[PDB]
Ligand SMILES: *[C@@H]1O[C@H](CO)[C@@H](O[C@@H]2O[C@H](CO)[C@@H](O)[C@H](O)[C@H]2NC(C)=O)[C@H](O)[C@H]1NC(C)=O
Ligand SMILES: *[C@@H]1O[C@H](CO)[C@@H](O[C@@H]2O[C@H](CO)[C@@H](O)[C@H](O)[C@H]2NC(C)=O)[C@H](O)[C@H]1NC(C)=O
Ligand SMILES: [Cu+2]
């Protein structure tokens with residue numbers, strides 16, 4: 001069952017063995033991934049999060065972010081620790097009470113404290129559209145058509161040794177998959193379809209790090225949604241999906257009744273499909289219960305290329321059609337050295353007082369805000385351009401902006417900008433050396449919004465800044481509930497801060 005839009009959600013520790021290897025985890029709703037939280041566009045979500053964590057090896061504090069939901073007027077509910085709140089302490093609960101006007105699509109939720117989401121606190125979040133303009137393109141769209149892609153580690157996130165390379169031990173598709181080393185024939189996920197029907201597959205990367213090359217043997221995939229934004233139909237046979245991105249695609253169950261491999265190849269960790277790693281099964285009703293015998297092609301015919309995507313609606317691009325053609329044109333210097341990332345020379349280290357609380361307490365310029373150099377003000381009602389030139393180690397980096405989606409005026413691996421009809425999305429690969437991936441948006445959402453790489457290990461190592469959007473109107477725009485005001489006193493008392 002899906003839960004929500006009004007629900008409790010308990011965060012617990014438990015052992016799980018999604019690839020046959022038992023380890024403790026941090027779970028929402030007792031499962032990995034967590035249960036789907038769902039409602040309809042415009043609904044009031046009230047997710048009362050109960051922190052029941054007791055194992056300090058994965059942190060007993062928590063905070064949850066609702067990835068891709070704009071939180072307009074509810075910045076306090078956004079979830080990034082020390083940006084919009086202090087964490088919830090164990091034995092306490094907190095109602096994330098917000099609305100989703102003007103949004104409908106495929107989202108997800110995850111811990112936003114340290115690297116805790118890697119330890120298991122991740123799940124889908126779907127906002128259905130009763131009047132979806134794409135409704136006639138498919139027959140089935142429900143919990144059985146959500147496909148999550150996850151990296152899974154045998155080493156606990158807090159226990160990843162300083163100075164050694166971090167790679168995953170298994171790819172999990174819908175929570176199941178096989179380990180790259182010491183592979184055992186643990187159960188694979190099965191996605192079931194009926195011959196002749198069409199499915200809205202909601203593909204969600206809940207990755208802490210790798211991107212995946214996703215395909216389904218014998219089938220192609222017609223993209224209709226990108227990170228919550230309806231797209232024109234784009235047929236592809238492979239999707240490279242970066243951490244935190246989402247696509248909806250129509251799967252036409254138009255192949256012979258049978259079994260077909262579902263493939264998700266990460267860019268790090270195990271390469272290939274030996275022993276059934278990196279795999280799940282598409283099974284038609286009436287097929288024999290056995291593994292597929294299909295193969296991938298050597299070369300895919302129609303891979304997704306980001307510049308091929310275009311919005312379904314006439315979204316355009318704000319500003320003027322040239323580089324720097326914005327009210328506030330920015331170019332960030334994104335770098336890595338000696339174990340830490342930096343943005344414009346500053347590595348992000350979370351502050352003691354959340355940025356939002358600093359603003360509400362009267363700190364009203366961004367030079368006043370801690371961490372020094374990590375908070376950049378944005379003016380209200382303005383076109384913002386942010387160029388994100390790649391080159392920093394550990395790429396390709398998927399950058400994500402809270403509080404907003406954005407026009408992708410320039411994509412990876414293509415030097416040509418598009419000021420006419422690029423896709424809008426919320427998480428974008430900044431590509432490879434020499435690229436100049438560039439985003440644009442308008443500032444109509446007062447509050448401090450995190451901008452960061454969504455490889456969680458890189459966020460932890462400092463690859464982030466905060467955009468303090470319309471500082472002057474932040475307090476009036478975002479009235480805070482008493483329970484939010486109680487978070488930092490409770491946290492600081494528990495931790496002797
Ligand atoms: C990415 O595009 C930005 C503009 O969006 C470029 O920024 C210019 O950089 C030069 C120095 O390299 C400055 O003189 C200009 O003032 C900047 N803004 C302009 C012209 O609008 C940036 O160089 C590009 N980066 C890469 C690596 O291609
Ligand atoms: C590189 O990106 C550019 C800009 O998005 C792409 O150019 C567009 O190509 C389409 C399809 O032929 C044309 O309708 C548009 O007029 C082009 N726009 C611009 C601004 O040139 C281009 O196709 C991409 N390159 C590749 C190889 O996909
Ligand atoms: Cu987010």
Ligand SMILES: [Cu+2]
Nearest residue numbers: 397453455458
């Ligand atoms: Cu990164």
Ligand SMILES: [Cu+2]
Nearest residue numbers: 065080402450
């Ligand atoms: Cu985030």
